[PDB]
């Protein structure tokens, strides 16, 4: 039900296998024969992708989770302006 | 009405949701089912108060206001080597470079 | 060099690399080549036509790549063909494969021209574009089956076959003996 | 499952042979036990193919898959091709009872659909929907192996 991501300076990420599949790029990962054997860990390495930007993304993962549904109101993602263009280029590389 | 948590230790973090009138113990089943320990071994953490596993989460102080999808709250995880508990240690995310001149 | 653990890895790693905006086509045929091909990972997927060989798809790569099992029974070979402008890598899990290369024919209707001529051995792992030319492969082996992964992006359904005697062309869209282990007639 | 290829890449040659008036399915158990088909062999046909020490097979009717015999029994294990010969999978009929030759062509006459159109007892169209599975066989052929 869970899956690991680990970003470039070694930080592991816990989150949701189904809210990791919000990305269209884990998606494809682990959706066809990518998906792990249960003999191999869950973990993925995104090697170019800082810790900082990796847990926002996650933050994104559960923002996008909770309120896709919500049929009456929705409050805005909030992207502080120092990891904006750091988190456009992980939003591009992970197709979501 | 639900809570997002960021359990944090040394470098892992977990992000899981939970209801503001579930129980500290509740949460530790939780990390017990993702990192196996059981909650006799473990330690949670509201910044540097540790909490009651009898204590709801609400009493705690995490609430739909300041622990959101989008701004997660976080929560302090010591698990306990043999004798007695580890020092609660979270090491920080990296740091984001300098805002480009541009951004202003 | 990251050398993929099984399967299932390298597909993950391939997934990852296609994301990117620059995909390195030397990076990619040396992580291919990497893998040590394990048939209890492939099986479902080699699935054996008698007269023909088969194409068995094994992941659509979000739109980006195409990943597909081609199957050769004794004696069956490909046509001549393009790629439709994309990039092709071939990887033997079994057997071998003889590759032909051809350059592109004369508008003039003469026999097309053999550049070079070899034979890929099991692992390895070989490329392609129209770039460096048309190609045939082949299992000439009388006893024993190929089997062969293939990487193509962008996805192509469609090439063209080209007769040997003329360089005439002819389109060609092309089918599969199964997709994700299910056969599809 | 006890009931699946070893993966040994030790090849060994094989010669199928149908020697039933049916249209042939060779089945192979994968390294998972699953079956897999492969070409079909028409009646009198024989066919050196390429396989493995320790790979299972078994053989059915390609079109209405009722099983068959190769070797006098249901699952075929080539060994290890002694100084380069051969093993022969002799393929025949096996001697079915006459209530399963029955079923059988009944079967081919009736649509599904229409089994309970027939003029038999009712035990008898729960037999004749009872179609013959390489699933079910390999159940039995497989608790049939445990009672050694
Ligand atoms: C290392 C390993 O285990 N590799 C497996 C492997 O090679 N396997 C597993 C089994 O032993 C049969 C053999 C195989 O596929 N042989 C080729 C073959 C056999 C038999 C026929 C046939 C049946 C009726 N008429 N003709 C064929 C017909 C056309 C083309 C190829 C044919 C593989 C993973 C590739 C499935
Ligand atoms: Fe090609």
Known sequence: ?96 | ?104 | ?185 | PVLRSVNSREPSQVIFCNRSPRVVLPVWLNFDGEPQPYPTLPPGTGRRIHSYRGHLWLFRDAGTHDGLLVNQTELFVPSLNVDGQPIFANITLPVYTLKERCLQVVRSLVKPENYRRLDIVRSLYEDLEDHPNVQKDLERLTQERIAH
Not at chain 2, 45 to 72: H, I, M, N, V
Not at chain 3, 27 to 47: F, H, L, R
Not at chain 3, 91 to 118: C, H, I, Y
Not at chain 3, 127 to 134: F, M, P, V
């Open chain 3, 1 to 185: 060099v990251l050398k993929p653990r099984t399967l299932a890895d390298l597909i993950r790693i391939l997934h990852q690399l296609f994301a990117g905006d620059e995909v390195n086509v030397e990076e990619v045929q040396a992580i291919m080549e990497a893998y040590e091909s394990d048939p209890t990972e492939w099986a479902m997927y080699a699935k054996f036509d008698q007269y023909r060989y088969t194409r068995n798809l094994v992941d659509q790569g979000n739109g980006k790549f195409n990943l597909m099992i081609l199957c050769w029974g004794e004696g069956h070979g490909s046509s001549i063909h393009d790629h439709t402008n994309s990039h092709c890598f071939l990887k033997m899990l079994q057997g071998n494969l003889k590759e032909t290369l051809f350059a592109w024919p004369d508008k003039k209707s003469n026999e097309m021209v053999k550049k070079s001529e070899r034979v890929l051995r099991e692992n390895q792992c070989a490329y392609i574009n129209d770039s460096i030319g048309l190609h045939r492969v082949e299992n000439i082996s009388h006893t024993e089956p190929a089997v062969s992964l293939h990487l193509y992006s962008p996805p192509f359904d469609t090439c063209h076959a080209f007769d040997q005697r003329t360089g005439h062309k002819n389109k060609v869209t092309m089918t599969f003996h199964s997709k994700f282990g299910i056969r599809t007639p």
């Open chain 1, 1 to 96: 039900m869970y899956v690991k991501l680990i970003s470039s300076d070694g930080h592991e990420f816990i989150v949701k296998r189904e809210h990791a599949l919000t990305s269209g790029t884990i998606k494809a990962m682990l959706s066809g024969p990518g998906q792990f054997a249960e003999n191999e860990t869950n973990e993925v390495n995104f090697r170019e992708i800082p810790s900082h930007v990796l847990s926002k993304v996650c933050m994104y993962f559960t923002y996008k989770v909770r309120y896709t549904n919500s049929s009456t109101e929705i409050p805005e993602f909030p992207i502080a302006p120092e990891i904006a263009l750091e988190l456009l280029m992980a939003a591009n590389f992970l197709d979501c």
């Open chain 2, 1 to 104: 009405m639900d809570v997002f948590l960021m359990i944090r230790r040394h470098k892992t973090t977990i992000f899981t949701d939970a209801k503001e009138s579930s129980t500290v113990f509740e949460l530790k089943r939780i990390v017990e089912g993702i990192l196996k320990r059981p909650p006799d071994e473990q330690r949670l953490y509201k910044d540097d108060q540790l909490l009651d596993d009898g204590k709801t989460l609400g009493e705690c102080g995490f609430t739909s206001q300041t622990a959101r999808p989008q701004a997660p709250a976080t929560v302090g995880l010591a698990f306990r080597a043999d004798d007695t508990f580890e020092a609660l240690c979270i090491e920080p995310f990296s740091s984001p470079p300098e805002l480009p001149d541009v951004m202003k």
